[PDB]
């Protein structure tokens, strides 16, 4: 079990580092998506005023 413990800790430590790479990739797409949100909100407000 002690040898098994040493190998499992490595996989957990490797997954933590890999997880950071995904969080940094997802947070960048949010920064890119944030640009779209203010524009698409404007276009939706235009349609609502035109309907009225």
């Amino acid at each position: 079990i002690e040898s098994e413990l040493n190998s499992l800790r490595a996989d957990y430590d490797n997954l933590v580092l890999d997880y950071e790479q995904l969080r940094t990739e997802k947070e960048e797409m949010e920064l890119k998506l944030k640009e779209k949100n203010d524009l698409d909100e404007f276009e939706a407000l235009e349609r609502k005023t035109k309907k009225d």
């Binding site: 524009l39 404007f42 276009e43 407000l45 235009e46 005023t49 035109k50 009225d52």
Partner: protein, 228 residues
């Protein structure tokens, strides 16, 4: 060499190699950028025009990495030597606005940064008078870039000055509100939000040519800007 006068001649000699010697010109541009950070009195008193004109032609290089780098160097000369662009406002604005329609994201991104510093480096009343004919006659996305700049510049003129410039500002803003592109219309709405924020209800007679739905949409973003 390191001698300031000798170095500029070598920089002007290397950067004159247009469309060729990419790495040798990148080093010269990075070296030219360092001279901008130094507040070197002797370099800029005699060689601003020569460097600017050679740096502006560089924006037309076939290499996208060379273009994007000159736009970063131009951004540095704009905020380190802003009083020197007095006689080159139209040239610096229109060249930076043309860089906004490059196919490569890295070039437009570096040009959007140069156009951001340009709003506070060019004289603000002078910057408006350069942007107005551009806004009223340019195609996408240059008209969009010029309106965004005018929004930044309008915030810097007094309420007495802005009213005098309204007869020239409002034509392009009403025209861009009817533009086919939604990004241009929003930039015009946000520009009118900046104009209303300065002169308040005095803007009301200028919006007589607006439709009811555009007036309603505009009042919505004025309220949204004030609420937070």
């Amino acid at each position: 060499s390191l001698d300031h006068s000798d170095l500029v001649a070598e920089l002007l000699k290397e950067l004159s190699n247009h469309n060729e010697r990419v790495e040798e010109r990148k080093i010269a541009l990075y070296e030219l950028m360092k001279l901008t950070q130094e507040e070197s009195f002797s370099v800029w008193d005699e060689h601003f025009k020569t460097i600017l004109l050679l740096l502006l032609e560089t924006l037309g290089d076939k290499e996208p990495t060379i273009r994007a780098l000159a736009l970063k160097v131009l951004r540095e000369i704009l905020r380190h030597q802003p009083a020197r662009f007095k006689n080159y406002a139209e040239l610096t604005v229109m060249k930076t606005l043309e860089a906004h329609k490059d196919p490569h994201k890295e070039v437009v991104r570096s040009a959007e940064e140069a156009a951001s510093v340009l709003a506070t480096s060019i004289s603000p009343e002078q910057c408006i008078k350069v942007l107005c004919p551009i806004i009223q006659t340019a195609d996408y996305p240059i008209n969009l870039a010029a309106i965004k700049m005018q929004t930044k510049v309008i915030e810097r003129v007094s309420k007495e000055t802005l009213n005098l410039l309204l007869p020239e500002i409002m034509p392009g803003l009403i025209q861009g509100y009817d533009n086919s592109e939604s990004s241009v219309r929003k930039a015009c709405v946000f520009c009118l939000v900046a104009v209303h924020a300065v002169i308040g209800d005095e803007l009301k007679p200028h919006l007589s040519q607006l439709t009811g739905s555009k007036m309603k949409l505009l009042n919505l973003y004025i309220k949204r800007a004030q609420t937070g």
